[PDB]
Amino acid sequence: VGHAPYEKRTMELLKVSKDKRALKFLKRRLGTHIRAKRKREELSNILTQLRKAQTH
């Protein structure tokens, strides 16, 4: 299935710019601080996991 827009709109805000803005944009799409923190830690877990298996 892949991601929704607001996951892909914040995966690109997680590779570069302002992890504090990956938690203002996720606290508007969810929107609580406890669910934003739980999703920013699981998009940034398959950001790094696909940083493994995109090559090999």
């Binding site: 299935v1 892949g2 991601h3 929704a4």
Partner: protein, 203 residues
Amino acid sequence: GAYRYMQELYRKKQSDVMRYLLRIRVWQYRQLTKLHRSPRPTRPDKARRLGYRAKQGFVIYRIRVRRGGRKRPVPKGCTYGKPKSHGVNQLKPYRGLQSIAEERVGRRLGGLRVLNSYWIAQDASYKYFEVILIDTHHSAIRRDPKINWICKHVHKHRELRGLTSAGKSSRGIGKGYRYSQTIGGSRRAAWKRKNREHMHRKR
């Protein structure tokens, strides 16, 4: 089994596989009637777990309802009263669109009981629902003792009385504290109690 994948697949409603599936299923079901028979349940994972079985006669009907608040039907010679009374265009029903959905099916089909209802699509002016409905005088709904409760007479038009799962939520029924004042039942059972004025014999 398959039935557990369908539960998660259908949670991905903002995806791309499951956006261009209930894209093509809101411009089929809106090129037909307001109220419509269905040969299947279109989501047979949510149909069961609401009560549907694949037994004759369990029956599914689609509706659509019109997605907004309630314009107050005052005559454009609008509401005469004190200024708290003047609201027309920003008021909301107390029953939801799903509540009112299976209400509109229970009337038009008086020979069948409404069990439960379920969202299948929506876009901007019409949410629409399947409704699991049951032919209660069938010789297989009545002879089979699991479903057999709704063949009784306290289940005549339950969906018009707040007794299906959708009509139930409008009422405000729970435990404990937050759900306090409908505490005898209804909400009006509770005003009757809380305002009940017992003169006693021995008093």
